[PDB]
Design a protein around this nucleic acid. Structure first.
Ligand SMILES: CCCCCCCC/C=C\CCCCCCCC(=O)O
Ligand SMILES: CCCCCCCC/C=C\CCCCCCCC(=O)O
Lengths: 194, 194
DNA sequence: TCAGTGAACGCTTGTTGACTCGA
DNA sequence: TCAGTGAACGCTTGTTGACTCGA
């Protein structure tokens, strides 16, 4: 219809919330009045879209989720080529973060700091990425010395590092080279296990 | 004097703030009125102690700092014994977290989520722990295949993991065994570099 | 039909000030 | 002398309701 305009106001409330966080503030400290004010609606209009600041947080987890998975697919595709595996995928990864900074900022900030419900949603997102990585290593036989249980712990290490790196990726020892160096240490670890 | 009582009210404002966070809330969303209410003073009494909720955050960074360094010293002492290095130090570490849960909770939550000034303070605390670890590995020749630059990146990986693990340490694949397994992967990585 | 409005609700907020009254 | 008080300041908050007016 022109309920294409409704969604446009939906995006506005979402984008305003993310961008309001860009100065150092947490999502939990944001008022509904200040988000509607930044998005361009009267306070009460917020409810034609969300009942809760919490419900907006959840839509913010779901939004990063689409973006983050479109990125993992591009890395997955790239893993089938012989050699250079790490450097290429870091690049694809950093490109995508660069292209989508405020979403990843939301993730980096709220991953442990928000209201429990939003922390639950982030936990689910992170278990799926970890599972998907455990499946992919299992599939390609990249760590032959690791059984199912050891892969789940390894995969969890890899996802823990990437997630712990996000904040320094947002705003020699340059991000790219460091993270790549750091992931190398972990891969080597995985190969020489026994 | 009995300005031993003043400090007691200082501890109360600090403890209340930390404990108010224990339900999922961020430090940034806490009002001064609710902290004084929980500590047992009239709102205005807060200023005989702090001018700012921010200044209280900074006293909360400094408090975790003493506790966290008393712990690192006990791990340092333990590193001079031949064998078992990892399992013992994890235990000492988890004991100390257990004994001081709400402080470490503060750290885990605010490490990327607070106001920039508190994020600065946490950054300084984390650089010092990372430097101290780089110095200690340098001292004992634990990673002979790594020059100064490589140690700073390794040390940063180790501190990144410990910090990224804190939240699951607060409230088979048990924390202790996982973290130990995960650190092993990293150590092995460090040894087989070249 | 319904996305966005404007007014009005009871309430909590950070900071002021001149105070009390025990160490 | 000064840690803690109690009242009062101008202001922002989440949610209500009956409304307007273009698609
Ligand atoms: C299969 C999707 C899982 C991707 C892991 C999560 C993000 C990692 C981003 C950059 C580093 C890529 C290295 C991944 C390990 C591949 C091992 C070969
Ligand atoms: C020297 C103090 C630095 C301590 C590192 C930070 C916290 C680590 C806690 C538990 C794991 C201990 C393993 C430390 C690496 C030692 C390598 C041998």
């Amino acid at each position: 219809p022109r309920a294409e305009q409704k969604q446009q106001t939906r995006h506005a409330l979402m984008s305003a919330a993310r961008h309001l966080m860009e100065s150092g503030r947490g999502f939990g400290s944001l008022s509904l009045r200040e988000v509607t004010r930044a998005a361009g609606i009267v306070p009460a209009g917020f409810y034609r879209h969300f009942s809760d600041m919490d419900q907006l947080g959840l839509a913010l987890v779901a939004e990063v989720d689409e973006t983050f998975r479109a990125t993992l697919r591009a890395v997955r595709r790239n893993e089938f080529e012989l050699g250079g595996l790490i450097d290429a995928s870091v690049r694809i990864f950093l490109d995508a973060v660069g292209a989508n900074r405020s979403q990843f900022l939301f993730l980096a900030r709220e991953q442990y700091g928000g209201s429990l419900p939003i922390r639950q949603a982030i936990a689910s997102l992170r278990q799926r990425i970890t599972d998907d990585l455990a499946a992919d290593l299992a599939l390609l036989n990249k760590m032959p010395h690791l059984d199912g249980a050891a892969l789940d712990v390894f995969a969890d290490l890899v996802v823990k590092t990437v997630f712990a790196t996000l904040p320094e990726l947002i705003d020699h020892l340059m991000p790219a080279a460091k993270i790549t160096h750091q992931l190398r240490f972990i891969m080597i670890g995985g190969k020489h296990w026994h």
